[PDB]
Amino acid sequence: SMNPPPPETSNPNKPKRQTNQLQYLLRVVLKTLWKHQFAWPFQQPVDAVKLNLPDYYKIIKTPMDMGTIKKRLENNYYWNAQECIQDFNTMFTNCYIYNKPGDDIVLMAEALEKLFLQKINELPTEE
Numbered sequence: 001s002m003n004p005p006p007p008e009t010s011n012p013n014k015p016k017r018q019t020n021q022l023q024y025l026l027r028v029v030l031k032t033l034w035k036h037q038f039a040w041p042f043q044q045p046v047d048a049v050k051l052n053l054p055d056y057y058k059i060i061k062t063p064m065d066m067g068t069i070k071k072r073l074e075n076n077y078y079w080n081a082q083e084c085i086q087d088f089n090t091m092f093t094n095c096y097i098y099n100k101p102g103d104d105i106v107l108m109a110e111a112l113e114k115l116f117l118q119k120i121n122e123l124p125t126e127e
């Protein structure tokens, strides 16, 4: 029940660009969630060994976390804004799959997702 390696965060065989959407995703979306009281469980990959979750990576085959997302944005790993939005959605969905309604972590994820949706509402337009 060991963990997999973390997701890749730096892509040498991909071109890089700054867009207004990617700027918003790091400076507004990621930074607003990262600073939230509830951010710590989501700031690095789930350590299923330390947390005593031996079936986690039997159930979750596309792990994702905000530490990964932050590094991806800082490293220009994403070309399209939708790649980053999908990673946030994957992170929340994984939490909902593994855990149960009423678990503290679920309530925490739901609060962070509401905040995500409030900030994504003001994502700027595509060039």
Ligand SMILES: COc1ccc(CCc2nc3cc(-c4c(C)noc4C)ccc3n2CCN2CCOCC2)cc1
Pocket: 040, 041, 042, 046, 047, 050, 051, 053, 094, 095, 098, 099, 105
């Ligand atoms: C003992 O090993 C660890 C490993 C990581 C961390 C970072 C914080 C933390 N990361 C978490 C991820 C999850 C989680 C997610 C996310 N998805 O499914 C599960 C299940 C749940 C709770 C988490 N928590 C608080 C856990 N509590 C309070 C901290 O000490 C342990 C008990 C802390 C301790």
